[PDB]
Design a protein around this ligand. Structure first.
Ligand SMILES: CN1CN([C@@H]2O[C@H](COP(=O)(O)OP(=O)(O)OP(=O)(O)O)[C@@H](O)[C@H]2O)c2nc(N)[nH]c(=O)c21
Length: 425
């Protein structure tokens, strides 16, 4: 068991899951990236089949491949393992303190859980829309507070629902609505003042180990939030991993065999580590990961590598070449006002090249072929340059001759892109 492999697998899995959510078919995209990614020179799919690491993004990728994962679920970034009791679901409408209706499954029954996070751990005891007890420990008061918030929302208590202020319209990267329980999570994670204010306070017995925490997140030996105790000693976070068969849908929601959602992209951490082992993504969907600059380098690199393939497709079947998925990373950098505008001008420049027969440039085709990917509109033509938006600044590529973005030295026969090299012919 290597820590560097585990750490790097998690980073690779998160990046792929985040990118996959924006796709039209997130599951198929995620599998494509998993099969075209290597970590420490080993294929990611081989690592996933051999690695026991349980983490949300990793387990989403494992699920995609039909592998077993932990039976536990993720909620608010905490791993929830049910240690006792059970519940049944009753679908209900509840009114927030903004009078927004939320359709939720109220869980009926008594249950006990451990909650395991990176900076905090807790035992949660709970009944129908009621938090009975929360024993929590963590690195600092802010980390304890994160766990408190999640448990309050998970409880589904009335006073939590009524503590909502303003409207809940949180969305993911694909502009899809978060589900109601995640609407509540994101809301109170942003600001828990009203939640903690309305929750209630109680006096506590001065027990050895246990202390209180107040609405302002400061500790107290005298009183605490209702049901909440802070363990000075860290709460026991160990258990044996029980792996089970799971299913997964188009949008990367992973379910156990009872149909309960264990994981989704909403449960994947936003934190970005620096990998200890080299991760190499070969998919074009991942060219964005190193910024807008590497997307240009990679786009032109890919054209030069597969030029004998592109040169055959360019003459015969041009519509198949324009509708490649490899030019979509380039098209995102092109300003939205001029995507169909340049797609006409450049597609007509290739039409004159085929019709006149003796105007085949090669350097002009590779330089401009990414602009022809969008749906074409009519063109005024005679453009001095074509703008491509990098980090804030809109650096432009000239039609004839070189530029800062595209610098082809004719003597060297090597293409440079924003300083860095990008293949050769
Ligand atoms: C409030 N919850 C939420 N929950 C589980 O947490 C996971 C994520 O909940 P969610 O984001 O509301 O998804 P959803 O599909 O709506 O969950 P549900 O199963 O409640 O319909 C699900 O597996 C859900 O069953 C719970 N599981 C148990 N055992 N007891 C509970 O009180 C609750």
């Amino acid at each position: 068991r290597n820590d560097d492999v585990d750490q790097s697998l998690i980073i690779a899995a998160r990046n792929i899951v985040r990118r996959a959510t924006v796709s039209a078919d997130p599951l198929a995209s995620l599998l494509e990236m998993c099969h075209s990614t290597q970590i420490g020179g080993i294929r990611m799919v081989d690592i996933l089949r051999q690695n026991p690491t349980e983490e949300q993004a990793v387990d989403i990728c494992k699920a995609a491949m039909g592998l077993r994962i932990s039976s536990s679920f993720s909620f608010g970034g905490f791993t929830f393992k049910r240690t006792s009791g059970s519940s049944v679901k009753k679908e209900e409408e509840v009114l927030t303190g903004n009078l927004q209706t939320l359709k939720i499954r109220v869980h009926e029954g008594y249950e006990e859980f451990t909650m395991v996070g990176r900076r905090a751990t807790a035992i949660l005891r709970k009944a129908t829309r009621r938090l009975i007890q929360l024993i929590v420990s963590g690195r600092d008061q802010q980390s304890i507070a994160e766990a408190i918030i999640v448990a309050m929302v998970f409880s589904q208590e009335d006073c939590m629902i009524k503590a909502v202020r303003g409207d809940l319209n949180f969305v993911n990267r694909a502009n899809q609505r978060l589900n109601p329980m995640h609407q509540l999570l994101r809301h109170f994670q942003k600001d828990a003042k009203v939640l903690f204010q309305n929750w209630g306070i109680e006096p506590i017995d001065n027990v050895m180990g246990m202390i209180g925490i107040l609405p302002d997140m400061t500790p107290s030996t005298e009183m605490s939030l209702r049901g909440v105790r802070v363990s000075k000693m860290g709460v026991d976070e160990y258990s044996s991993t029980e792996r089970v068969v799971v299913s997964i849908d188009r949008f990367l929601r992973v379910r156990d065999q009872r149909g309960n959602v264990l994981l989704s992209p909403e449960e994947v951490s936003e934190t970005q580590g620096t990998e200890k082992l080299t991760i190499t993504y070969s998919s074009s969907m991942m060219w964005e990961i190193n910024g807008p600059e590497s997307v240009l380098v990679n786009t032109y690199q890919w054209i030069i590598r597969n030029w004998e393939t592109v040169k055959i497709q360019w003459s015969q079947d041009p519509t198949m070449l324009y509708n490649k998925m490899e030019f979509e990373p380039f098209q995102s950098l092109v300003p939205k006002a001029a995507r169909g505008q340049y797609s006409g001008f450049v597609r007509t420049l290739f039409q004159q090249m085929r019709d006149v027969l003796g105007t085949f440039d090669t350097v002009q085709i590779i330089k401009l072929l990414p602009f022809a990917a969008a749906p074409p509109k009519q063109s005024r033509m005679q453009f001095s340059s074509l703008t491509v938006n990098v980090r804030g600044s809109g650096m432009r590529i000239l039609v004839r001759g070189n530029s800062p973005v595209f610098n082809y030295n004719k003597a060297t026969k090597r293409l440079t892109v924003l300083g860095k090299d990008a293949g050769a012919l």
